[PDB]
Amino acid sequence: SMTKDNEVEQEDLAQSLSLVKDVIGAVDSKVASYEKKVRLNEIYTKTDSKSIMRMKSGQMFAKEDLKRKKLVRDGSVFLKNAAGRLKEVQAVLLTDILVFLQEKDQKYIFASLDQKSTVISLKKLIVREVAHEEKGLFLISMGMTDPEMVEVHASSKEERNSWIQIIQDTINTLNRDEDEGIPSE
């Protein structure tokens, strides 16, 4: 608890002590965290409300969730399903979840893969560099019990590490203050 709601209470970029939206001149960047929550509001807005999945714990993770957390990264990456058929999904890395979004019906959906984790609740995620792919990346949920990781194929050989680094970017600053290990957000 950082006296910053549940959505803003992560040192990643939000404190009642430091980190941008502390209470200083940098606190003016909070509205742009609202704006950051606002492309996320948009990305909350196109996203199908009930086209959800069962993430790390097996919960129903939905649109309402995304709403609240921080837009920290966004980019499209392919997803190898059980059949090995790729969907270039709009992956949104948020300070609280790592969510994939399949473009359906002039909007998105949770790219639900009906087995893997198409929305990896942040903090203490496991991110690995696939051996059987040059541009691939596993965004995994092993931190709990059993993940059944999903195949995140980056747009470039580098981009996979470019994405890897981002959990190594976000979660490393999440862990910094907060606890370690959170299921279902």
Whether 26 and 82 share a structural domain: no
Instruction: Name the DSSP letter for residue 67.
Output: T
Residue 6 neighbours by CB under 8 Å, 6+ apart = 68
The full DSSP string for 130-143 is -SS-SSEEEEE--S
Q: For residue 45, with 0-12 CB atoms within 10 Å meaning exposed, 13-18 middle and 19 or more buried, which class applies?
A: middle
Count the alpha carbons within 13 Å of 166 in the hemisphere toward its beta carbon: 24
Distance of CA 173 to CAs 14, 63, 121, 132, 135, Å?
10, 25, 15, 30, 25
What tokens appear for 49 in the block? 């409300």
Q: Which of 14, 46, 70 is the last residue of a domain?
A: 70
Whether 52 and 80 share a structural domain: no
Whether 63 and 92 share a structural domain: no
The helix (run of H) or strand (run of E) holding residue 169 is helix 157-177
Whether 7 and 24 share a structural domain: yes
CA angle (119 as vertex; 153, 83 as ends), nearest 5: 50
Count the alpha carbons within 13 Å of 36 in the hemisphere toward its beta carbon: 21
| Strand ranges in the chain using DSSP code E only, listed in sequence order | 53-54, 60-61, 71-80, 86-94, 97-99, 102-104, 107-109, 119-121, 126-128, 136-140, 150-153
Residue 160 corresponds to which amino acid? R
Residue with tokens 């979004």: 101
In contact, 168 and 98? CB cutoff 8 Å: no
Whether 66 and 78 share a structural domain: no
Whether 8 and 97 share a structural domain: no
Count of structural domains within the chain: 2
Q: State how far the Cα of 86 lies from the Cα of 153, in Å rounded to an integer.
A: 9
Q: What is the CATH number of the domain that holds 79?
A: 2.30.29.30
Q: For residue 96, with 0-12 CB atoms within 10 Å meaning exposed, 13-18 middle and 19 or more buried, which class applies?
A: buried
The CB density around residue 153, as the number of other CB atoms within 10 Å, is 21
CA angle (151 as vertex; 149, 153 as ends), nearest 5: 150
In contact, 102 and 108? CB cutoff 8 Å: yes
Residue-number span of the structural domain to which 110 is assigned = 71-185
Whether 75 and 160 share a structural domain: yes
Q: State how far the Cα of 130 lies from the Cα of 145, in Å rounded to an integer.
A: 20
